[PDB]
């Protein structure tokens, strides 16, 4: 039998606990897999059981939990369960240009925008889901959608104003 463990950081223990029900149910009723979370090692372990359905989907289940560890909502990770052409791309803001201190914070605020609005706009433009950590940013979507969202994010951290990126990404989505 195969097993796979997913670590849980301390900032994700309470979200994991609070909606644990809608996390362990879609694995045991749909994919027929057998899971637990140990507190001594702080690890969510998934292993296959006897009444397993479609064994070559175990990885998908792991991706489920993995997405919820990165900060994605459980609906988007359940979409990662359903659709097969869904991928995850992660990178740092300083990983493409060195920004230090207040410049880094301003780049984060430019990606987010007021009320998160700019970030939210990009999602509805690209049919993706973006959660950005303290310096990390994660995009969930299909390949070309990831490329479009990465294009918009990289342009926003270049220093291009959010208005121009807003208009250009709407025009690119029109195409």
């Amino acid at each position: 039998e195969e097993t796979r463990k997913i670590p849980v950081p301390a900032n994700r223990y309470t979200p994991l606990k609070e909606n644990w029900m809608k996390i362990f149910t879609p694995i045991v009723e749909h994919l027929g897999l057998q899971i637990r979370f140990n507190l001594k090692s702080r690890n969510v372990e998934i292993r296959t059981c006897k009444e397993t359905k479609d064994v070559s989907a175990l990885t998908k289940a792991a991706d489920f939990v993995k997405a919820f560890i990165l900060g994605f909502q459980v609906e988007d990770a359940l979409a990662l369960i359903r659709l097969d052409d869904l991928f995850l791309e992660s990178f740092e803001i300083t990983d493409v240009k060195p920004l230090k201190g207040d410049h880094l914070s301003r780049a984060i605020g430019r990606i987010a925008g007021k009320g998160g609005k700019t970030k939210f706009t990009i999602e509805n433009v690209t049919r993706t889901r973006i959660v950005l950590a303290d310096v990390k940013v994660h995009i969930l979507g299909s390949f070309q959608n990831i490329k479009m969202a990465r294009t918009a994010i990289c342009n926003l951290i270049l220093g291009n104003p959010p208005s121009k990126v807003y208009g250009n990404i709407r025009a690119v989505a029109s195409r």
């Binding site: 609906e75 988007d76 359940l78 979409a79 359903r82 659709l83 049919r127």
Partner: peptide, 25 residues
């Protein structure tokens, strides 16, 4: 949700539109 958005973009809207057109004694 994400899958709802993808499937809404993958399908075609339909449903309601009222088109108003057109004995005893």
């Amino acid at each position: 949700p994400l899958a709802d958005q993808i499937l809404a973009g993958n399908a075609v809207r339909a449903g309601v539109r009222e088109k108003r057109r057109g004995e005893e004694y």
